[PDB]
């Protein structure tokens, strides 16, 4: 009754594209990002796409074409266990490690890996990847955070920091990292270095084990199951950074199966369309029943 739309409305209605309906893409931002200076004719503009789901971080290096965007390299958080991180796969430090991983990966496949080594001895400093003299002018890439809020302490900028320390030239200021004082507009490296390695998690683990233990049992459970203490958190991230810098070359999964074996069950399961003759018969039956004096 009240929930009714007119044929005029639905005939005059112009749809948003598709990803605006799906609420996934700001085209006003994509315009500014992918649009290249027309005198750099086919020079591609490369986005570090950092996206956050529940239970996963996604980092991709993406260029644009008319038939669709194209990926150079991709790095997820569910493959960090290779390097030694099984817990906290969405935290600030896992974002840092994902950025470092995709940086070293794309540099390895491009040939910019022995030069532009990046920052090995982390210190919490604000420094951009500088160009070496008589050198290849490091790889340049711009953040695409998407519909995520630019906010101080947000963990998209942790991936940014990691990609910067890995050797990518990601243009950025330091006023969205943690440790940034608002009253005195400068940066504090100590809090940032603690965030890189999980001080904001280890401190909470300690302050919970000392105050409320049932919470420390329901969450931080896997740390107990696998013998990880608050102080054991810095070392595993420090070692994961080294393992990443050693072998970031994306060993994929074995897949356990083939595409056709995977598709057979889903096709068996998936509901299918109804033919035109079937539709006509389905309507004739309803005429003969509901209108044929039941």
């Amino acid at each position: 009754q009240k929930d009714a739309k007119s044929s005029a409305y639905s005939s005059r209605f112009q749809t948003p594209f598709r990803r605006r309906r799906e609420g996934k893409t700001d085209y006003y931002q994509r315009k500014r990002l992918v649009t290249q200076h027309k005198a750099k004719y086919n020079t591609p503009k490369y986005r570090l796409v950092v996206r956050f789901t529940n239970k996963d971080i996604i980092c991709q290096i993406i260029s644009s074409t008319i038939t669709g965007d194209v990926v150079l390299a991709a790095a997820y958080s569910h493959e960090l266990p290779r390097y030694g991180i099984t817990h906290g796969l969405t935290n600030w430090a896992a974002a840092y490690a994902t950025g470092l991983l995709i940086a070293r990966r794309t540099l390895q496949k491009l040939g910019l890996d022995e030069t532009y080594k990046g920052v090995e001895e982390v210190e919490g400093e604000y420094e951009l990847t500088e160009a070496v003299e008589d050198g290849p002018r490091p790889f340049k890439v711009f953040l695409d955070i998407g519909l995520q809020r630019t906010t101080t302490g947000a963990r998209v900028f942790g991936a940014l920091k990691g990609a910067s320390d890995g050797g990518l030239y990601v243009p950025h200021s330091e006023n969205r990292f943690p440790g940034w004082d608002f009253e005195t507009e400068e940066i504090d490296p100590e809090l940032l270095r603690s965030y890189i390695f999980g001080g904001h998690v280890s401190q909470y683990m300690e302050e919970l084990a000392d105050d409320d233990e049932e919470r420390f049992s329901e969450l931080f459970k896997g740390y107990l199951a696998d013998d990880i203490d608050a102080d054991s958190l810095e070392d595993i991230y420090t070692s994961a950074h080294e393992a990443i810098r050693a072998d970031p070359a994306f060993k994929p999964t074995e897949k356990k199966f083939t595409k056709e074996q995977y598709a057979a069950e889903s096709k068996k399961y998936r509901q299918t369309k109804l033919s035109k003759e079937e539709r006509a018969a389905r309507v004739a039956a309803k005429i003969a029943a509901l209108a044929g004096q039941q």
Binding site: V283, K286, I287, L290, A291, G292, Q293
Partner: protein, 72 residues
């Protein structure tokens, strides 16, 4: 009515013809077509004009109206 319109003609300028229409009243249908649609239940009177059944649309509504057509 032919005489009433033949008298009206004098009030207008120009040439006006009087035509007997092959349709049923103010309808766009011929006489036998309207008759063979009213013998069945395609037709439904309104205050002055008439509504016709279509083979398009939802079937619940076309049975809520025009049941004489389906009661075959």
């Amino acid at each position: 009515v032919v005489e009433g319109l033949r008298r009206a003609r004098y009030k207008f300028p120009g040439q006006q013809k009087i035509i007997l229409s092959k349709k049923w009243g103010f309808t766009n249908l011929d006489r036998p077509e309207y008759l063979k649609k009213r013998e069945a239940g395609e037709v439904k009177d309104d205050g002055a004009f008439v509504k016709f059944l279509s083979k398009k649309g939802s079937l619940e509504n076309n049975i809520r109206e025009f049941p004489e057509y389906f009661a075959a």
